[PDB]
């Protein structure tokens, strides 16, 4: 499943 | 075009109309700052490669100490939901809440009375913790995790010796299946998006507002204006920004709806209950 990005 | 005018008053009039039956809330760190939890967006001793490494799974799994040191520093003395959380509770009780999608891990939506089915905790929760080993996955409660945090002992599984982490989604981790399952249904038919306390910088959470039908009005309540909002151009037709703190924005909207008294009573009785614990 898609991952948490942009931090 | 469902809003008569691109104003808070316009949004309130729309919410009062029979058309507005189902509302999705999309919330971030800005809804919890007045609850004494700072926006994550004394650690000098760890010589982090860059500040962001503190919330990255690859770095955390090998060097968990900086994260747990920060957790100690920022751990609140009490878990007390804000006016903004209680505004969402009002939406729930009035049958208007389709879902609350939250980026926060602080459990304040739950404490405010939003139930499991009301919530998509997109970035997990601090409430429960687990051993990282797939063959073990021993569960640990908040009291156990808090004790490790305050005593400055790195959480370790009592069975297999692996790292224990809070059930938060670190950067680089997959979001829960529930996030994608709910996203596929909720945004097919929704009357209003209420975007509060988030600048929509974190993916795939940021992508959610684009999933709504093109006619669905969207109100932002945030300190400042990456989701694809259009407030100001000549082509603006459905997006409204209210700039300031989330508590004050929710109070302003509640007053226009005629809910000011209801909201303030709710906040005061629930705060009293929490303080009397
Ligand atoms: Zn284990």
Largest sheet of chain A: none
Number of strand segments of chain B: 9
How would you sum up the global shape of chain A? rod-shaped
What small molecules does the structure contain? zinc ion
CATH superfamily of the largest domain in chain B: TPP-binding domain
The CATH architecture name of the largest domain in chain B reads 3-Layer(aba) Sandwich
Report the radius of gyration of chain B as a whole number of Å: 20 Å
Separation of the first and last Cα atoms of chain A: 18 Å
Structural class of chain B: alpha/beta
Largest sheet of chain B: 6 strands, parallel
Q: Report how far the terminal alpha carbons of chain B are from each other.
A: 48 Å
Describe the oligomeric state of these chains in a short phrase: heterodimer
Protein name (chain B): NAD-dependent protein deacetylase sirtuin-2
GO biological process, one term (chain B): lipid catabolic process
Cofactor (chain B): Zn(2+)
Organism (chain B): Homo sapiens (Human)
Give a written overview of the molecule:
The complex is a heterodimer of chains A (7) and B (277). By secondary structure, chain A is low in regular secondary structure. Chain A is 0% helix and 0% strand. Chain B is α/β, with parallel strands linked by helices. Chain B has 2 domains: 1-33 and 82-122 and 177-277, Rossmann fold (3-Layer(aba) Sandwich); 34-81 and 123-176, SIR2/SIRT2 'Small Domain'. Helix content of chain B is 32%, strand content 16%. Chain B has helices spanning 8-16, 57-62, 65-74, 83-93, 108-111, 142-151, 177-186, 246-257, 260-275; strands at 23-27, 97-102, 119-121, 124-131, 139-141, 164-168, 192-196, 218-222, 239-243. In chain B, the strands form 2 sheets. Chain B has a 6-stranded parallel β-sheet with strand order 3-2-1-7-8-9, sandwiched between helices. Chain B has a 3-stranded antiparallel β-sheet with strand order 5-4-6. In chain B, helix 4 packs across helix 9. Residues 131, 133, 136, 138, 157, 159-160, 162 of chain B line the site of zinc ion (ZN).
